[PDB]
Enzyme design. Structure first.
Site, mmCIF file in Angstrom:
data_model
loop_
_atom_site.group_PDB
_atom_site.id
_atom_site.type_symbol
_atom_site.label_atom_id
_atom_site.label_comp_id
_atom_site.label_asym_id
_atom_site.label_seq_id
_atom_site.Cartn_x
_atom_site.Cartn_y
_atom_site.Cartn_z
ATOM 1 N N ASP A 130 15.661 -3.935 6.619
ATOM 2 C CA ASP A 130 14.022 -3.849 6.681
ATOM 3 C C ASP A 130 13.761 -2.322 6.864
ATOM 4 O OD1 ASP A 130 11.128 -4.184 7.234
ATOM 5 O OD2 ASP A 130 11.736 -4.953 9.168
ATOM 6 N N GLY A 176 3.894 2.834 1.266
ATOM 7 C CA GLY A 176 2.470 3.194 1.217
ATOM 8 C C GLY A 176 1.334 2.365 0.578
ATOM 9 N N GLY A 219 1.335 -1.065 0.902
ATOM 10 C CA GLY A 219 1.032 -2.181 1.973
ATOM 11 C C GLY A 219 -0.477 -2.419 2.286
ATOM 12 N N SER A 220 -1.128 -3.529 2.755
ATOM 13 C CA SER A 220 -2.440 -3.475 3.239
ATOM 14 C C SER A 220 -2.745 -2.918 4.612
ATOM 15 C CB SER A 220 -3.111 -4.994 3.064
ATOM 16 O OG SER A 220 -2.439 -5.602 4.270
ATOM 17 N N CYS A 268 -1.286 -0.294 5.483
ATOM 18 C CA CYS A 268 -0.505 0.965 5.391
ATOM 19 C C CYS A 268 -1.785 2.138 5.140
ATOM 20 C CB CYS A 268 0.463 1.084 4.470
ATOM 21 S SG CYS A 268 1.207 2.691 4.459
ATOM 22 N N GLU A 310 1.967 4.612 14.684
ATOM 23 C CA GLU A 310 2.552 4.306 13.439
ATOM 24 C C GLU A 310 2.251 3.165 12.788
ATOM 25 O OE1 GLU A 310 6.819 5.074 14.180
ATOM 26 O OE2 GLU A 310 6.104 7.556 14.931
HETATM 27 O O1 LIG Z 1 3.254 -1.322 10.127
HETATM 28 C C1 LIG Z 1 3.499 -1.068 8.904
HETATM 29 N N1 LIG Z 1 3.117 -0.001 8.230
HETATM 30 C C2 LIG Z 1 3.134 0.273 7.007
HETATM 31 N N2 LIG Z 1 3.634 -0.767 5.928
HETATM 32 C C3 LIG Z 1 4.220 -1.983 6.587
HETATM 33 C C4 LIG Z 1 3.875 -2.103 8.260
HETATM 34 N N3 LIG Z 1 4.294 -3.558 8.488
HETATM 35 C C5 LIG Z 1 5.010 -3.909 7.319
HETATM 36 N N4 LIG Z 1 4.615 -3.063 6.310
HETATM 37 C C6 LIG Z 1 4.957 -3.227 4.627
HETATM 38 O O2 LIG Z 1 3.846 -3.928 4.112
HETATM 39 C C7 LIG Z 1 4.450 -5.024 3.433
HETATM 40 C C8 LIG Z 1 3.127 -5.928 3.418
HETATM 41 O O3 LIG Z 1 2.166 -5.408 2.590
HETATM 42 P P1 LIG Z 1 0.639 -6.524 2.259
HETATM 43 O O4 LIG Z 1 1.258 -8.044 1.661
HETATM 44 O O5 LIG Z 1 -0.182 -5.674 1.504
HETATM 45 O O6 LIG Z 1 0.268 -6.829 3.657
HETATM 46 C C9 LIG Z 1 5.582 -5.318 4.083
HETATM 47 O O7 LIG Z 1 6.461 -6.089 3.271
HETATM 48 C C10 LIG Z 1 6.152 -4.074 4.514
HETATM 49 O O8 LIG Z 1 6.828 -3.682 3.505
#
Ligand SMILES: O=c1[nH]cnc2c1ncn2[C@@H]1O[C@H](COP(=O)(O)O)[C@@H](O)[C@H]1O
Ligand SMILES: O=c1[nH]cnc2c1ncn2[C@@H]1O[C@H](COP(=O)(O)O)[C@@H](O)[C@H]1O
Ligand SMILES: O=c1[nH]cnc2c1ncn2[C@@H]1O[C@H](COP(=O)(O)O)[C@@H](O)[C@H]1O
Ligand SMILES: O=c1[nH]cnc2c1ncn2[C@@H]1O[C@H](COP(=O)(O)O)[C@@H](O)[C@H]1O
Ligand SMILES: [K+]
Ligand SMILES: [K+]
Ligand SMILES: [K+]
Ligand SMILES: [K+]
Lengths: 350, 350, 350, 350
Positions: free
Chosen positions: B140, B193, B195-196, B198, B298
Site C-alpha cells: 500500500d 492523485g 482519488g476522491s 486527494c 497530508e
Molecule cells: O489520504 C489519502 N490521500 C490521497 N489518496 C488516498 C488517500 N487514502 C487513500 N487514497 C487513495 O484513494 C483511493 C480511493 O479513491 P476513491 O475511490 O476515489 O475514494 C485509494 O485506494 C488510494 O489509492
C-alpha cells in the site's frame, strides 16, 4: 481498444462564416424542402418534407394534435410507440382522416404522419400501423447499432418490400451508419447523449458530441452514395438548443432535424399546461424515465416554458435559418451543405 | 527534464461509442470474471474475481464485514494494514473462518480476502498474514516506483517463492509498471492523485489523470506480455465517480477496479453511520490524514451519503456496466477491451 | 462544407511578449498616426488619422458632439445612417462648419467626419452626404460579403470615381476581404459577433473570434498588396474590452479600431445620462435592437458606466498603448505590426 | 507579427510523474543548495544559496528583518530599491553588521543580503549599496528586455569589473535571456504577468504563462552554456501559489525562486499585522501600486493571511519539496532538473 485523434464537439462550439450573398437571396425565396427517405442517384425522394423539422418519438411530444399542426407547416411527426398498438394506430388514423400552402400531404391530400416502432412487437405493430395509414415508420432506440434493428427492417422488407418506409437508429459514426444502410434503412437517425433530457454521465456513459456525430455520419453517407448510388437521408436527433443550431446541423449535412423539447413547449404537445408561480410551463419527460418506460433510474421529468402555438414559433425559427442561409450564399439546403464555411470556436470564447 | 506531447485526461473526459450489439448480448449473459494475479501465456490466473471490483486498503473501507459482503458478491477486499499486525491478522482470520452463486472462495469454500502491507514491517507482518490465511497481499503506497517495493517483493519470493501473491503500486506510466513487473509483482495498481480524497495540488503535486495513466500502463503491460509471455493484471485505483467510469476503466484495459468512496457509503463499511441534519452519512477519511497515519497535513476527513447495503448497490452498478458492455458488443471484459471505441470529449461539452 | 484546422480565438486569449526596448522609445515619442483609405505602393494615404480610433456607426454613439470631440483628439466618427437622410446630413454639416495639436482636419482646417450608409437608399443618401461635406463614407452592415455592397461601391465609383471614399464590411476572412477589395472599397471592416452588444448564439450563429478574424484578413490584405501594389487599410470592429486589446488589434495588423461601448460611456455620446441607484450610467443599444431598427428580436438595450469626457479617457488609454508599444520595441503602428511577438494563452490561465 | 505554435501555460497546469525512488533518498539527505551567480564550465558559483528561495524586491516584503530571517534559513533577500539611497543602504548595513546550521553568510560569517536597483539613479545608488556591504544586486523591472538594463550592467562592469554581481530582468523568452546574458547579467529573472498582485489583462496585456516562460528561458540558457561555457542561473519570479509549484519551477530548470506574497504573510515582513474580523492578516501591495511608486492605476493593494514566523513555514514548504524530489528520484536540484518527468494536465481535470 480504439481511440480517436480529436475530441467530439457539440453544436455550441461552432459558428458559420458568411459567404457571398447574391441579390436574389432573400428569405422568401429560400427553399427548405428536403428528402425523408432514400433514393437512387438521378432520382428524387418519394417523400420530401416542406421544412426540415420532425417531432420526436416521445409520449410528451408527438400526439395527434402535434402531428396535425406540424404537417400543416410542412414537417412531420412520429407518433410515439410507447403505448398500445391499438392506441398508436388510432392516432395515426385520426391524423390521416382529419379532413374527412406548405402543408405536407399525400396524393389524397391527407396529412403525412410517421410512427415509431420497437424491435420487439413489430410483427403485430407494423401491420396495424400500415393499415392505419402510416406514411413512414422509425425504429425508436438510443443504440441503433443492433442486430435487432437489422432483423426488424428485414422482416419489413420480406413482408412489404420497399413499399413501407422505415428509418433506423440512433448511431453516431460511419460504422453504425453503414450497418443500418446495408440493413436497408430508408433514413438513419444520428445522436446519442445529446438530447436535452439526457445526462449521459449519470446513465451509461455512451455517446458523442452531436456535431462530430453528424459530420462523421454525413461523410460516411456521402462515401456510401458514391459507392452504391444510394442516397440515404440522415436525421440529426437532439441537442438543438438555439435556432442557429438548426442551420448548423443542416450545414454539416443532416437532411432534417428531430426535436423534442423545442416542440414540447407548444400548445399542441399532448402534455398538461401548468402555471407555476406566475410562469406557464409544459410537462416534458424522456422516454427513458420511469414515468413512461413502465407501459436506479434511466430518465428525467421536467418543465419547459410555454411558447404558445407551433405555427408562430416555427415560422420565426425558420425565418432566421433562411436569413442565415442567405448570409452563407444558399437558397436551398443542398446548396448550404455544399457552400457552408464552418468554424470551431475556442472554449474561452464560450 | 522530460515532457509529454499530450496533457493527461480523467475518466469524465471520455465516452464510449456503441459497436454492433448481437442478439445474444443481454445483461444476464455478460461474464464479469477477471484475473487478479499474473500467469503465463496459454494459462489462466490462479485467482479470478467474479466481479471486477475490489475495496480500497483503507481503515474507513475494508474491515471484516466489508470483506465478507464483497466476497459474497464475487469481489475481494484488502484489509487495511494501517493497524497492528495482530489486529489485521485477526480480521483476515475472521473472514477465512466465517463459515465455521457468485461468492468468491478458495478450494475449501472459504471467502477470499486480501491484506495490505507496507515496506517497513513486512518481515513480521507477512508471515502473520499468511498464517492467518490471507489469499493475496498488496503493498500500500501512493508512489510504488520505489526500490523499497522491489525489496519487499524480493523478500517474499525468497521466503515463499510464487506461493504468496503480492500486488504492488501505485504507478502511472510504463516505466513504473515495468519496474514493478521485473521486481515480480503479481498485479500492479494504477493511480496517483485521482482519488476522491486527494487534492494533489495542495499536497506534493504528483500524479496524472487516471484515464491517461491506465491507457499508458495497459499499453506497456501488453508490450511486456508480448516480450515475456507474462500477463500481469492491472488495477485502476481511484477516481471512480460514476458507474460508467467503471466501464471506461475496464474498456481502457484495467482488469479490475479499486474503490474507496464507493464502498464507504455502505452499511458494511467499518465507519460510523452519522445522521446529519436529516441526511444519513458515513465517515470517510484518507490513509494520509492525521486521523489515521499516526497509528502541515497530508489528508482529508469527510462524509459520504449512506447508500444502504453493498449487495443492492453493486448489483445495480454492474447491471449498468453489463448493459453498456452489450452496447459495445462485448460479453466479457476481454472482449470489451478489444472492441471498445473510446472518444475524448471537448471541455465545453462537459 | 468547409472546415478549419484551428478554432477561432478572441483578444482575451492573447498576450504580447516584450521585445528590445531602446533608449529612444518613450510614450511621448510614439507616433499613432495611421492610414484610413487605400493607396498604392510608394504612396501615402490621402487621409491619416492622428490616433487609430474611430467611433461606431451607431445612434447611441456617433452624433455631432462625439464627432467633434473625437476629431479634436485625432480620431474620426462615423455619423450613424439609421436616421433620415436630411437628419444625418445636418450632423455632417454641423461638424464641418463648427469653427465658423492632434486635431484631425481637412485643408480648410475643418474637423474630419465620416458617415455610415446602407445598400438601399444610397442613390439619394450619398449625394446628400457628399454635399454636406462628408470626408469619408462607410457601408454599415453585419455581413459585408454581399453583392449589395459591390453594387453600392460601384455606383459611387461611376458617379464620383475615386473622389469619394467608402469603407465596406463587415467580413471575417480572406475571401470576404478579397471580394470587397476587388469591388473597390477604400478600407474594410473586420468583425461579426464580437461586439459587446452581440449575443451571436442567440441570433443567427454567424461570426468568428475577433482575433482570428483580424489575423486572417490581415494576411490576405498583405498578400493582396503584394499582388496588386494596393494597400487597403483594415478596421478591427468590436470586441475591445480592455485597453490592451487595442494594442493587440493593432499588433495583429489592424490599421485602426472601431469602438461602440468604449465611446458610449462618454459625456459626448448622444444618449441620456441616467443616475441609477447611486451610479451614473449612459444608455447603449445596438443598431439591431428594435429600439433603433424600426426607423423575435435582433438586438439588446443596456447601460454603460459613465466615464466622463472623451479627452481624459482617450489620453489615458493611448498612453498605455504607447507604453506597451515601447515594451515591444515599436515607435509606430507599422513598426509594432512588424515586430510584435504574440502568444496565445491557455484557457486555464484565464 | 510573430506567433507561436502552442499557448503558454501556468504552473497549475502541470504535475510531476514519479521516477525511481532509491533507498538512500529521504528528505534529510536532500541537498537544496543552488547557484546564485554565473560561472564557467568546470567551476562552482561564487555564491550558493542553501535553499532556493529569495524574497521579492518589494517594500511590503524585503526589509531588514526579512533579510535576516531568510538568510538564517539559507536563502537571501533583495532589499527593495523603491526608497531613498540612504534608506536602502542603511538596511543593507544593518543586515551585514547584525552580529556585531543553514545560515547563508560570507567569509566573515555575516549574513548575505541583496539589493534591488533601478536603471535611473544607479550611478549614485550602486556605490552606496556596495559600500554598505551588499553581496549582490538586481535590477528591478517588469520588462528587462531593455537597452536601459544593458547600460546599467555596462556601467557596473566598467567601474567594478566582475567584482560586483548584478541580476537582471524580467524576461520571458530566449531572446530576452540572450540579450541580458550578452549584456553581462550574473543571473536572469523570469516572469511577466504571473505575480499574485498582477492583473495583466487590466494593465498593458504583456506577459506569458510562468511555466512556459521558465521552460523556454531554461532551454536558451542551456544552449547558451553549450556555446560559451558560461552557466547563468535563472530565477522564476512570481506565480507560486502552492508549495508544489516550487518543485515544478525547479524541475523545469529554474535555479531559484523569487516570492513576494509567500513571504509577506510572515511576522518578519515590514508590513502591519492587521486583525480583520477575527482573522489576522498582513498588508501586501505591489511595486506598481500608487501606494508605492510615488516615492489610471498600475497596481493593487491587499491583505494576506498571517502565517506566523518565516522559519516554521519555510521548513514545512521545503520538507514537501524534498519529499517530492525523492519521489522523482532526485537528491539535488540539478538531479531533479535532469530526471523530472513533467506532464501537462487537461483544463477539465483542473
Ligand atoms: O489520504 C489519502 N490521500 C490521497 N489518496 C488516498 C488517500 N487514502 C487513500 N487514497 C487513495 O484513494 C483511493 C480511493 O479513491 P476513491 O475511490 O476515489 O475514494 C485509494 O485506494 C488510494 O489509492
Ligand atoms: O429519456 C430519455 N433519455 C435520453 N434521451 C432521450 C430520452 N427520451 C428521448 N430522448 C432523445 O432525446 C431526443 C430529444 O432531444 P431534445 O430535442 O434535445 O429534447 C429524442 O428524439 C430522443 O432521441
Ligand atoms: O445590434 C447590434 N448587434 C450586434 N452587433 C452590433 C449591433 N450594433 C452594433 N454592432 C456592432 O458592434 C460594434 C460595437 O462593438 P463594441 O465596441 O464591442 O460595443 C459596432 O461597430 C458594430 O459593428
Ligand atoms: O505592482 C506590481 N504589479 C505586477 N507585478 C508586481 C508588482 N509588484 C511586484 N510584482 C512582481 O510580482 C512578484 C511577486 O509575485 P508573487 O510571489 O506571486 O506575489 C515580484 O517579485 C515582482 O516580479
Ligand atoms: K454573405
Ligand atoms: K450497439
Ligand atoms: K522590451
Ligand atoms: K518514485
Amino acid at each position: 481498444a480504439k481511440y480517436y485523434n480529436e475530441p467530439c464537439h457539440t453544436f455550441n462550439e461552432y459558428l458559420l462564416i458568411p459567404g457571398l450573398s447574391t441579390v436574389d437571396c432573400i428569405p422568401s425565396n429560400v427553399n427548405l424542402s428536403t428528402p425523408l427517405v432514400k433514393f437512387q442517384k438521378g432520382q428524387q425522394s418519394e417523400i420530401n418534407l416542406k421544412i426540415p423539422l420532425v417531432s420526436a418519438i416521445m409520449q410528451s411530444v408527438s400526439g395527434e394534435k402535434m402531428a396535425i399542426a406540424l404537417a400543416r407547416e410542412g414537417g412531420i411527426s412520429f407518433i410515439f410507440g410507447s403505448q398500445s398498438i391499438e392506441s398508436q394506430a388510432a392516432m395515426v388514423h385520426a391524423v390521416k382522416n382529419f379532413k374527412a400552402h406548405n402543408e405536407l400531404v399525400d396524393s389524397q391530400k391527407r396529412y403525412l404522419v410517421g410512427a415509431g416502432i420497437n424491435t420487439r412487437d413489430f410483427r403485430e405493430r407494423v401491420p396495424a400501423l400500415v393499415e392505419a395509414g402510416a406514411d413512414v415508420l422509425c425504429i425508436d432506440s438510443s443504440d441503433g447499432f443492433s442486430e435487432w434493428q437489422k432483423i426488424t427492417i428485414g422482416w419489413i422488407r420480406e413482408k412489404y418490400g420497399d413499399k413501407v418506409k422505415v428509418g433506423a437508429g440512433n448511431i453516431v459514426d460511419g460504422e453504425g451508419f453503414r450497418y443500418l444502410a446495408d440493413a436497408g434503412a430508408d433514413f438513419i437517425k444520428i445522436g446519442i447523449g445529446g438530447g436535452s433530457i439526457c445526462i449521459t454521465r449519470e446513465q451509461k456513459g455512451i455517446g458523442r458530441g452531436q456535431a462530430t456525430a453528424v459530420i462523421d455520419v454525413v461523410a460516411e453517407r456521402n462515401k456510401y452514395f458514391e459507392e452504391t448510388g444510394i442516397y440515404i437521408p440522415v436525421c440529426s436527433d437532439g441537442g438543438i438548443v438555439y435556432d442557429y443550431h438548426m442551420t448548423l446541423a443542416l450545414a454539416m449535412g443532416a437532411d432534417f432535424i428531430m426535436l423534442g423539447r423545442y416542440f414540447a413547449r407548444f400548445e399542441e404537445s399532448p402534455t398538461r399546461k401548468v402555471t407555476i408561480n406566475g410562469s406557464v410551463m409544459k410537462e416534458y419527460w424522456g422516454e427513458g424515465s420511469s414515468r413512461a418506460r413502465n407501459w436506479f433510474e434511466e430518465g428525467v421529468d421536467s418543465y419547459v416554458p410555454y411558447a404558445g402555438k407551433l405555427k408562430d414559433n416555427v415560422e420565426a425559427s425558420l425565418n432566421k435559418v433562411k436569413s442565415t442561409m442567405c448570409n452563407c450564399g444558399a437558397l436551398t439546403i443542398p446548396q448550404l451543405q455544399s457552400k457552408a464555411k464552418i468554424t470551431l470556436v475556442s472554449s474561452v470564447s464560450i
